[PDB]
Amino acid sequence: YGPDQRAQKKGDIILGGLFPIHFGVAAKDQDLKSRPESVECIRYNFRGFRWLQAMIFAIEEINSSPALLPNLTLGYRIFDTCNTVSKALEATLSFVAQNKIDSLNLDCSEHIPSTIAVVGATGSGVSTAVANLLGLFYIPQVSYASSSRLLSNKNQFKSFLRTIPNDEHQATAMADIIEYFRWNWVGTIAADDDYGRPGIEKFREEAEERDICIDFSELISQYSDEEEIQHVVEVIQNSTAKVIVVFSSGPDLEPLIKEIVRRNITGKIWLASEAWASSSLIAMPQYFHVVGGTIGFALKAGQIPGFREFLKKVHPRKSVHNGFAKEFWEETFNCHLQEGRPLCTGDENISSVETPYIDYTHLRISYNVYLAVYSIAHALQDIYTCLPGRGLFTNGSCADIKKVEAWQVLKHLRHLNFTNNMGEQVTFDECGDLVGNYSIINWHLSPEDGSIVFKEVGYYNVYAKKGERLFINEEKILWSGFSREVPFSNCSRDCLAGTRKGIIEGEPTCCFECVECPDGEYSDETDASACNKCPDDFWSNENHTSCIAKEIEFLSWTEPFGIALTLFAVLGIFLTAFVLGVFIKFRNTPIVKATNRELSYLLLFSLLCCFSSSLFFIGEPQDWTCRLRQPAFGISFVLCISCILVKTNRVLLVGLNLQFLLVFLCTFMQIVICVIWLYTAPPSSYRNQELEDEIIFITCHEGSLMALGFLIGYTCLLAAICFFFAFKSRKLPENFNEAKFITFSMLIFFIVWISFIPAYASTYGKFVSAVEVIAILAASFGLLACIFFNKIYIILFKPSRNTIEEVRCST
Amino acid sequence: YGPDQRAQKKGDIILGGLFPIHFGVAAKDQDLKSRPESVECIRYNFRGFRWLQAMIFAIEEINSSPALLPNLTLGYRIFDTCNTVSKALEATLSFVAQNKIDSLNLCSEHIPSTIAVVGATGSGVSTAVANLLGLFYIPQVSYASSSRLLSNKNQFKSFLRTIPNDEHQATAMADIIEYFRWNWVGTIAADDDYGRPGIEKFREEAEERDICIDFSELISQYSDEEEIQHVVEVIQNSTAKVIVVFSSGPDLEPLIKEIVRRNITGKIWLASEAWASSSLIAMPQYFHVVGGTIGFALKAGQIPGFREFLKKVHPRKSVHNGFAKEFWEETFNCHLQEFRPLCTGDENISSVETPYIDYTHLRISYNVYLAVYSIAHALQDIYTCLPGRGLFTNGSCADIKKVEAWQVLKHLRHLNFTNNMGEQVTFDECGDLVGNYSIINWHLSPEDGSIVFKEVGYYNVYAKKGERLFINEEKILWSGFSREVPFSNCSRDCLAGTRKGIIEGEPTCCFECVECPDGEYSDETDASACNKCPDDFWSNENHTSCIAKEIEFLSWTEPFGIALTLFAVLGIFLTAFVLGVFIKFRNTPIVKATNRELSYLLLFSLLCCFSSSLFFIGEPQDWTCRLRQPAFGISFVLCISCILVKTNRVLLNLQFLLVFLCTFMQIVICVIWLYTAPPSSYRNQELEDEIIFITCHEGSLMALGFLIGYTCLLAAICFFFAFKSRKLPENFNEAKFITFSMLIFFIVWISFIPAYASTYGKFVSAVEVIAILAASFGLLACIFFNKIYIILFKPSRNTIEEVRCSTAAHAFKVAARA
Ligand SMILES: *[C@@H]1O[C@H](CO)[C@@H](O[C@@H]2O[C@H](CO)[C@@H](O)[C@H](O)[C@H]2NC(C)=O)[C@H](O)[C@H]1NC(C)=O
Ligand SMILES: *[C@@H]1O[C@H](CO)[C@@H](O[C@@H]2O[C@H](CO)[C@@H](O)[C@H](O)[C@H]2NC(C)=O)[C@H](O)[C@H]1NC(C)=O
Ligand SMILES: *[C@@H]1O[C@H](CO)[C@@H](O[C@@H]2O[C@H](CO)[C@@H](O)[C@H](O)[C@H]2NC(C)=O)[C@H](O)[C@H]1NC(C)=O
Ligand SMILES: C[C@@H](NCCCc1cccc(C(F)(F)F)c1)c1cccc2ccccc12
Ligand SMILES: C[C@@H](NCCCc1cccc(C(F)(F)F)c1)c1cccc2ccccc12
Ligand SMILES: N[C@@H](Cc1c[nH]c2ccccc12)C(=O)O
Ligand SMILES: N[C@@H](Cc1c[nH]c2ccccc12)C(=O)O
Ligand SMILES: *[C@@H]1O[C@H](CO)[C@@H](O)[C@H](O)[C@H]1NC(C)=O
Ligand SMILES: *[C@@H]1O[C@H](CO)[C@@H](O)[C@H](O)[C@H]1NC(C)=O
Ligand SMILES: *[C@@H]1O[C@H](CO)[C@@H](O)[C@H](O)[C@H]1NC(C)=O
Ligand SMILES: *[C@@H]1O[C@H](CO)[C@@H](O)[C@H](O)[C@H]1NC(C)=O
Ligand SMILES: *[C@@H]1O[C@H](CO)[C@@H](O)[C@H](O)[C@H]1NC(C)=O
Ligand SMILES: *[C@@H]1O[C@H](CO)[C@@H](O)[C@H](O)[C@H]1NC(C)=O
Ligand SMILES: *[C@@H]1O[C@H](CO)[C@@H](O)[C@H](O)[C@H]1NC(C)=O
Ligand SMILES: *[C@@H]1O[C@H](CO)[C@@H](O)[C@H](O)[C@H]1NC(C)=O
Ligand SMILES: *[C@@H]1O[C@H](CO)[C@@H](O)[C@H](O)[C@H]1NC(C)=O
Ligand SMILES: [Ca+2]
Ligand SMILES: [Ca+2]
Ligand SMILES: [Ca+2]
Ligand SMILES: [Ca+2]
């Protein structure tokens, strides 16, 4: 036979089942000093007993109806695995015992029944160990809870089927949930078995595609010792990540949760996989301050109508075929059953004690057990109603229901398609898998009772296009059980505008510093990895949020220095017009006729042009003022020097009038120099940007310096010749000491235009035009004063008629 | 009973063996009235047959020996697994058939008992065998399974191995990668219990050492076309040149064939131990892809009679080996009687080159040898146990006539023996050994063209962390032909004037280089932050190091300051000479006529005016700049007052009062200016970045205004009262010269107005100095240079009447009108 505690019943066709009635086995490390005994199972599991009852209720309901398998009863043989590979293998060796006597040729009870199909285990490692042995004899195994991706491999597992989705959609959904709430800094914890490792590897692969940085990654187990648990707890406690993604079940997560609760570590955001998101080992009222507000996945519910009334009929004396009912009665009512702790009577009421057996709201894994039994029954009904010539075997032949074999049932299970009680269609794919939606739940705290309440906050729709599968209603979520604000789980705070992301070495790419943008660059947005250089005509604001236009610099009108220069120029023009009016008003008087009368008019006109030529420097330096600011002053002032130079004594030793030829031939050189310079290479405007970054100047580009050198040197040469021929005869008393005044005027010229040299070599912006204008007006006021003011003071001032006569002029 | 072909011999105690005599099975499916028949194994493995011969040789050598297990013979039942789980479980069901009948109470009545099994090769196979053998506590010693998941003794109760596990090898891969300074790799692992935990341990160790991983893929022996195309696309879309592979030969052969048929060259392959010596991959047709591979190997051992036993195999004389017949058929390509030609029993096995006798080193064969001798020494410990000293309950001993499998497992846990090379064998608490690694490189034989595995280093697991690796870099050919180490970084290194910059969406190993701005620098290679060096320093034009900003001031050892100091010294040693020749000629006539005591005070004030020029040279400090300008102000107002007062005044000594008042009225100003807003030194850094200007901040400007203004006023009035007497001939026409001097003053302090406003804050001090040393000379000359001549070049002209009316003007003799 096999294990002695079982639920079995005879029939024409026998099914097999494997359920965890205990949570684990007793902790005993054997030292092998004596022959090893059988291990004992410890903690009773009411949920697994309900799953076993779901299988038995399905079998009895199928045998009741006359439409699903007429005149042919099903039987069963069900064992207990205790979530352990070894006990499951001791059961599976009894399943395959008749097949294996044939294959190993041992020929001896000869009344051993044969098992057609087995309802599978809950854990993936247990399912792999059972599947390796059931695939040898082609016995089909349908699992209700194993969801590892490794069991989709049909090269290794030839006869495995399941009614639960595999876990790739769940890890993708976890990555989508993390992307929805805009986190990037997470930690991961998985169980060290075939369920946790592929799930957490698939989560890691999906997480690096979405730029989510994982801080830590640790493995746990039910049989971890103490120092591994303090290593994992110290890894959790050292990290700044708040969101932790866990692939585990209840038994593998319980020691870690107990040690975290003992140290009272709060503030973490847990992401549960489906195995522990509804686990009564973890959803405890005294753990809540650690595990409140846990967000998890759940399967879709289903309706089994007469099931609760079947569940309330269990009894130790009336369940002859069920052998697990006795310990159920003992563990519910805390008594001892004395077959024929206080002593039981067998009369107690199941509703009086609250256990997970009938305290439930939805049926989720129990529905998978129900559907597995109906899948096997509709495969056998497909065999029963097969028509000759239309079968699934050679030449369209049909199997015999009276001598059916397991490989033919597996063949009909691969081509299976049927409608359940809820109206949906059930079909397995080529990998032997089934697909379904997910519900998304949150852990709350009951106000009526003080216990944990699972509230649905969203769904995950697996038939939708990628990136459109998640729905979450955020207004129904209490973070950490009580808070209404979404928590912060990034590595570092976001950089603002005006700054830039900087690397921290040895750390992942989600962790950065915020460095301010440099002097000439902005940053427009938040979380900028670079600073953008501002355009040529604009310079960055001090805030560095955005940049504004530069400041243009030029000496201008409507400026409190240019107004002063303009008023001085107008005063000079008014003075020259006054002197011209005085000379015209008395032109038959001897003082003006003793001087050359026809020649002073050109002198006064040249002084008028010299005053008016200084206005070209003031203002915005356009193109046609840079071309005429120097030649106008050059020509006008050389005309002035020539008109001075003719009227000196002893400089006319050698046409109709013979004094204007000297003036014409001395002005003609400046005229031709200006014409050839302005023809070969004219000056231009120039926007100067290389002196200061913040401001730009508007200046005049000269074009050449050879022609400007000639145009200054010729004027200095004429000034030197006139100064020589005036200083040589300075003692002559004629014309009211005129040669002395010519000497003083040329001296003032040379002092001003030597003393204004070092302004040019040092100043660079507005001040150059200022010192040019001040120099021009200073030189021309000096020349006008020194030539004419003594003559004016004699003509009309208080010595009016006394010193005006011709006999006084040369005395 | 069980599988049909087997190697089988009987004795007192029966062992068991699982070896991969084939490489795999053939493919089929589709139960369309196939009552499913047994599947066929396809490709013959000569290395696995050598491994099977090692076990038989060890058993026969023990049975010949009188020192180990006397009067007790060992036996064997050995099966073929074909590297698949299902054949191994078919054989293991035959191992445990007797213990099974005791359990389920379910016969042949002649089933022998197996007490130990020499284990499987693949970790996926050994896991499935160990799950069923641990039910009955039958020990299982494996020779090649190296997955870390088999170290878990809560699940695998009776598992031991004579090979080390793969934690050290996965750490050693990251050590080798960190040795050659690469940080940008890709990983490939098989999809089973050997590849996935090894590559996960490597990923953890690589992320600990700041090594970035670009891709990570999984392959299998049963991958279809599209998965291989996807992996090849992933490989040749990447710039990483180093690929780390955890796989065996059969799981890697399809991928290698697809890479070979495309010319994908230049990759650097890092081999794990299972495929670094595989004959399926190390072939001459693949050398342009897999040449230059660097891989791991175990330590070799000696079996001193194994080759002559290997050359003794015959199909008709090996009556206890059922696998010899297919060996003979597959070697000489013939058919044995009981189209390919007929065999004779007369061939020499030294002709055909197969992996059977063509090896250099025994590595896994030595592990099979040790796995047999471990079981033999545990049974020897059972046989030589003294009562009172046993490992069981009351110090009792096991019975050798009626031994049980759990008792052999108990002695296997407490084993410590010494092997044939004088080293100690013992298992730890997880049932493991530890051992060194050899590091090999793939080369090309110049004599034949086959692939040679050349040792280039070792990995020592008994050393401490960080000192376990020795690599001789001179012996490596890098793709089989190259002598330079490849480049396998994501991006190039940044230079001395640059820092790193983030590429958004890419890992930390992929960056940009951005130059440091003005004022910062960098000096190392990978900077990631520019540095601002401290105050009064500015960066170079290279942004490598920063140099010191130079300070700018009128210095003493600068030659311009030397020239100005020599003009000052000439001025003082001119006025001192004037003072000396005045003191010698006091009572002479043309000296007593100018109020001789005012001349001495005038020269004292003028010497102070010369000496006030030296306060403007040097680095400006607090005590110097506060006394720069008031010294010149007081000295010059004393000069102007002494020049002004010596013209004759009838009413309003009782004359010096004036010379008091006219200076006192400025002294007070100076006082107030130093007691409400004194000037100070000031470093002005904002004009030029690379130049530090040191100058003065002059406090309140208004005060200075006042100062200057007063001076000027008291000059002007003097000028006027000199000019009014300009045509009055007395004192060699003194008045005129006074006027001239005053004019000079004015001109010198007017024409220096633009330059003072031009270089202000940069080089104004020099300007000032020049102005002073022009004005002072003016005074001196124009006042007291005319008389000197008549003092000491024309004697007997210094008479009284000349002071009244002078015949010869001279005026220096006009310098003799040179
Ligand atoms: C935490 O980090 C994430 C990712 O780094 C930030 O989310 C990004 O925000 C910007 C601006 O709104 C979007 O353009 C990106 O698409 C977001 N990323 C994702 C993946 O959605 C998030 O803003 C950060 N949270 C806080 C509080 O700073
Ligand atoms: C593992 O490898 C190390 C490194 O070669 C071995 O240590 C050396 O052994 C040789 C030969 O006995 C000595 O000459 C050296 O001095 C040893 N040390 C070093 C640092 O090279 C070690 O013996 C090997 N272990 C085993 C068990 O073989
Ligand atoms: C590839 O990258 C690595 C690490 O980013 C560089 O290794 C550094 O090399 C320098 C000099 O060779 C050492 O000073 C550093 O200590 C190394 N860093 C580490 C972490 O080991 C390597 O130089 C790069 N290779 C090339 C060619 O640029
Ligand atoms: C208005 C005045 N401009 C002098 C520019 C000097 C300069 C500035 C920059 C570069 C150069 C250089 F190219 F010559 F070096 C020279 C000017 C104009 C015309 C005649 C003049 C005759 C006598 C005195 C002044 C004259
Ligand atoms: C040494 C000198 N320091 C300030 C010169 C300013 C200035 C620069 C250029 C021109 C002028 C002036 F024309 F206005 F004088 C003044 C100084 C100190 C104290 C008294 C002074 C009296 C007269 C002159 C200089 C005086
Ligand atoms: N999916 C889990 C089994 C499982 C699902 N739901 C559960 C609820 C309780 C316990 C286990 C489970 C596995 O693969 O092993
Ligand atoms: N270590 C491999 C087995 C192995 C080691 N060396 C080998 C050489 C050839 C083939 C297989 C192997 C495993 O765990 O599966
Ligand atoms: C965690 O932090 C503690 C204290 O800073 C430190 O000693 C320890 O090394 C860190 N890491 C782990 C794994 O405990
Ligand atoms: C645990 O933490 C909570 C905070 O939520 C605190 O109120 C309580 O006192 C703590 N208990 C212990 C035992 O530290
Ligand atoms: C299953 O049967 C229904 C009934 O019409 C059909 O619509 C559906 O396509 C079938 N499914 C498969 C996979 O054949
Ligand atoms: C999955 O969910 C969507 C909407 O949430 C629903 O329309 C669909 O029918 C669900 N799938 C199944 C199989 O019920
Ligand atoms: C820019 O700086 C000013 C300070 O004057 C501040 O008022 C303003 O808010 C800043 N602009 C921003 C932050 O956009
Ligand atoms: C590889 O690169 C090509 C071209 O760059 C691209 O079209 C293709 O999608 C890539 N494939 C993968 C698997 O990345
Ligand atoms: C593959 O590349 C090599 C160069 O390394 C070349 O010699 C060879 O011809 C290529 N293979 C084929 C089939 O062309
Ligand atoms: C094994 O035995 C030798 C002596 O026989 C001893 O030196 C050595 O320490 C032993 N090893 C262990 C692990 O006990
Ligand atoms: C440093 O600058 C000098 C000249 O300024 C140049 O010659 C030299 O090459 C630079 N050094 C570098 C670029 O490493
Ligand atoms: Ca029925
Ligand atoms: Ca790091
Ligand atoms: Ca012997
Ligand atoms: Ca990316």
UniProtKB/Swiss-Prot annotation, chain A:
Listed result of changing residue 431 to S/Y: Abolishes ability of agonist AMG 416 to activate G-protein-coupled receptor activity
Name of the protein in its database record: Extracellular calcium-sensing receptor
Shown residues within the full chain: 20 to 876 of 1078
Outcome following mutation: residue 748 to A: Abolished calcium-induced G-protein-coupled receptor activity
Free-text note on domains in this protein's UniProt record: The extracellular regions of the homodimer interact in a side-by-side fashion while facing opposite directions. Each extracellular region consists of three domains, LB1 (ligand-binding 1), LB2 and CR (cysteine-rich). The two lobe-shaped domains LB1 and LB2 form a venus flytrap module. In the inactive configuration, the venus flytrap modules of both protomers are in the open conformation associated with the resting state (open-open) and the interdomain cleft is empty. In addition, each protomer contains three anions, which reinforce the inactive conformation, and one calcium ion.
Tagged with keyword Ion transport: no
Family per record: Belongs to the G-protein coupled receptor 3 family.
Outcome of mutating residue 122 to A: Abolished calcium-induced G-protein-coupled receptor activity
